[model samples]
Target: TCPFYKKIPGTGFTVDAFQYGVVEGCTAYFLTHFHSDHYAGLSKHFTFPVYCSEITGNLLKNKLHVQEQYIHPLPLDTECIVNGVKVVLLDANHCPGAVMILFYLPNGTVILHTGDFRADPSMERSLLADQKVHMLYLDTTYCSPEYTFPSQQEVIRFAINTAFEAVTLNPHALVVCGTYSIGKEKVFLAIADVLGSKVGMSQEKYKTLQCLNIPEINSLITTDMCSSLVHLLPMMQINFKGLQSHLKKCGGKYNQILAFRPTGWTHSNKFTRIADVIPQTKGNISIYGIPYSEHSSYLEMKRFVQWLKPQKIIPTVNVGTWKSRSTMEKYFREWKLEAGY
Candidate 1:
């Protein structure tokens, strides 16, 4: 129910997934990033030509096994023509290759699809300065004031400092850095650089990072868990059951284990834990949640809308329990009214 797709009028291009067969007859598919939710229906068997960033294209071919012939690299800041539509890919500032697509239509209308991006300053200077966007497909993952979070850079610094403190408190503990399969490389890289230790990551992640060709990252990757002081753990399985499996795999070798989960959801005020300290502890394992996120907050999203001033707003994801389009539109209308529009 989360994944959504839209067809650009007169362009014949389908954005995101075609799940549930709601619509058909798409000329091409445009992928925003490698996140599974956004790329739900894509697979190796699919034969449609998909457009995405170089990093995302590689992930589709190598990780998802999508055919190389069907993948088209959408370079950042470059304009190109695809099936009669003029398109430009801009940095999303969410992940390494995440992008916000700009579509120039034949009828002098412009559309922007923000594929899970933050309110980046460079993006503002690049696009908002000249173009008048007609419509916006926004990422409303955090369309509430309660979800306010700091920038990813600040969160990365906090994570590094927290890891150092955790290690100092328990000198013999093994630090486990939890992250998504593709994003959040910054957290691990920062910790390694700060602590002067190599990173132990999965073979697949190592291969993906190797393709990035950043010497700083390539030189720090290792498959041998014991080779590095810090181990990179996947967040897909970060629950209690997953922790049991993780501890069984490496708990015996270390005196203790300290885990760090960097995400925006930790900003919820329901928790009594200190923001700077470890939020949860289980026996020998200590888990801390850092306020790192890629999605824009309510204020950030409002500011983005104010900057772009699109004629119509389309929410890409559901806001809270309100899944109806009408309901969401009404909220947007109210927000515009309150925002002094």
Candidate 2:
């Protein structure tokens, strides 16, 4: 995802390139979202002005405790002048406070940076769809044919049904769903609502959820492990070894464990077109890898690109290798050619 030195070709602006130290000519720094992959290099001691969505601004303060003076929170859809550049934030629909940035440079260059987004028709209604971007920084997280998967709602429904069924079969099962610091709250929240179970997590995660304005926040999540049967932990902990530790940590409070690791990668496997992939189980522990991704699928990306037909395409992620980058560019060209743009 790190494209060496990430300075916008025509402008002094840098979008989501925090990790490469500092670019010499960088003046305006725009962050597309609060996700770590995009904001990897951002430190509390960051020097340049950071522009992002209002919710992302709050996340920066709450999570990273970055300097308020350096953080510039912009409301979505409104264009405003940042120094000499005109900037606007479009709802990314990836996570809470996530946004796609549109930059209008002084030289009359127009650029759109999709931090990370799940492509949908709603994006078409925005000003971005109608305008021809001089250069488009695309979220190519799933930029391959095999990456096609079900929609977020369908995958979430599948997770809810799977978790509910597992709980119904094993009444004494402890449920755990994978999540990020700010993403994938919907899956666990939906599972909790249907199963009527308490949500468990670390104290910091509990604090983070309230900022998102989730429905029924007070009753939904708890910091205490003893009072809750359904727990939400980081995606890194959804594997067999980590879950076994979490289960054992509870000291026999539950008979078994039912866990879920939700991501688009699971769907890209050989069984990509399957309606519902089976869960992996050993003894009392069952881990279900659900296709619940916040990033756009390959089909969705193609459709979005074909519709936008930007002047140039830039793949954001999985492009460290030249072969992968070329493959993504090939798809982009194919899609653009489909529209005769």
Candidate 3:
């Protein structure tokens, strides 16, 4: 009866953020990220009280420009009751604003619901030692075997080295890379390290990166000039009328234009549809498929399950009913919750 799990409204348990139809009469809510899907339900019409970390509250109030009247900001790792439900926030290493939530029940059930997260052994090392979680609800987005991921550093290095190789191969063209603001910061940090000069970042993303405390290897340069450096992640969409196309058309002022994205993301129609630009234009255009993601991969999920050692497993965001619908299902199976309950 405590810490119940149910599906949300029509959306991907996928981590786009908004999972709508979770519980019918629940009063309190806990949000882990500033992303749309995570908080899509908290529209102007819905004014239920929600719990989040302090930084998360700031992000919703400032970046996404949400009203703060209903936000109950809690410090990380502290236990608090929102109205009456005991809740604790855990750092989920996926993004700056993301978190994993632990809902403590009166019946002694501890439910750990991980909002889309990446498995960093370093993070897990600390998490395993501190918490005694019971019911495990995992991020099973990468549950399929096809997903592969390199460490954040490794992904950054690959992007820089790939850019370097491309530049060296052709020193006269301008290269453009496509990435999100946080991802673009990774590119800037990597390029600064490899080129022995600083790469500039946008003010908002810069502030976000500053909170992350990842040191830069070189100084940063901010300008609009046609420099040899690749264009960092611009907030461009894939539509023909989007800013990405406008930037591509401007490539004639330089020698090359290259786009960078995670291998999985760029594979989608949103990116592939724009491939016509390379053959139709004057400047050389390309797509760099560097494997990276903000969420944990299959192996990482497996490791988290083993470490949690929960008495029961309840998967909230998955679709359909089956004995092994998800990793949580598997863990539930192994733990004999299915057999007993």
Candidate 4:
């Protein structure tokens, strides 16, 4: 039941870093990104080799600290072999270390597995200029009409504006924003511009950002660059139960601050409201809802599908199946049926 290729006989394998089933007949595995969902199943079995871009490879090997015996690195816009299958890794612009795999078979059948992608036209144009895909496996995460998210730039602006607004709204407050450590360069850039200085960051995030040319815009004074005003505090990963106490430690000093991560959208309801099992927080935390999505919006998903014009498409990443599940299911069901899938 994967969004892309269907599992052949005896293909189920890993589950939560433990081996589960037999994938003896499995040919190969393609990872679109290093995200948990994309590569989580791999933890279970030791396949012949896992194929992905160099960035993804580094994140897995170095960042993820997985020293798997069969891990292989594939260059971007380049081709490689996996279980003897010819494949290439394309840029997926949704986040750093993310990619889309273009798998070509002996019968001239080409299948694209887009792990998770956004409507970054740059990525689409880059792929269109290079590859010739046949069957497209799309990221129908935001295919629903109701899933209209804000543009990347617009969202960037909103995140920055919201943070400043929070500061104004609560003279004594700290805004903890949750966004991807990568891919949110625009947000950081906006922060630098608003605060007129590079903020603080964890050494790991700073190094990663520097490699991808993101630090140039951040207003950190680590180097001999100009000084920064707002402190871009590095978060200490802790349990939700312990977050309030931890935040309190970093609060009192600053009159106002924004504390969030790439995951701040989870607190938002405008995208699509869903029921909450955990009791909601009320006062101390001014949870802001920004319609910012890392993946492609509905329009972008449609455009990607139309451009590829594949005979059939398998949409994955189940964006609609989330709290906003109904919206996505309806959109994918209707579009896929119309597309004769």
Q: Rate the local accuracy (lDDT) of all candidates.
A: 0.76, 0.81, 0.57, 0.54
List ranges where model 1 is wrong by over 4 Å: 1-5, 18-23, 211-215, 236-253, 270-277, 319-327, 338-341
- Residue 6 displacement (Å), model 2: 2.6
Point out the higher-scoring one by TM-score: 3 or 4: 3
Collision count of model 4: 23
User: Estimated TM-score per prediction?
Assistant: 0.88, 0.91, 0.71, 0.69
Q: Which residue pairs come into collision in candidate 1? A: none
Question: Alpha-carbon error at 47 in model 3, in Å?
Answer: 2.6
> Candidate 2's C-alpha lDDT?
0.81
Best-fitting candidate, measured by TM-score?
2
Q: Supply the global lDDT for candidate 4.
A: 0.54
lDDT of 1: 0.76
Candidate 3 C-alpha lDDT tens digits along 1-341: 22334322121112222345444555556677766656665554446566677767776565655577876788777777655556667788876667887666666656677876887777665545676777666777666544555567766766677667666787554455555544335655565556544454456654554444344422354444344355555546422234346465555565555555554333342343322313223335555555567777766766666666666555544545463475445554554543443
Span of 10 residues, lowest total lDDT, candidate 1: 269-278
* 37-143: candidate 1 lDDT, tens digit per residue: 77887779878788988988888888778898899997788789988889999888787778999999999999999988887656678855787889899898777
Regions of candidate 2 where Cα sits further than 4 Å from its true position: 1-5, 272-274
TM accuracy, model 4: 0.69
List candidate 4 segments past 4 Å from native: 1-22, 41-47, 81-84, 129-132, 162-175, 179-185, 201-244, 259-285, 319-341
- Provide the lowest-lDDT 10-residue window in model 4: 9-18
Candidate 4 lDDT over 2-59, as tens digits, reads: 4224331223211112122444444455556656655655542354556566666666
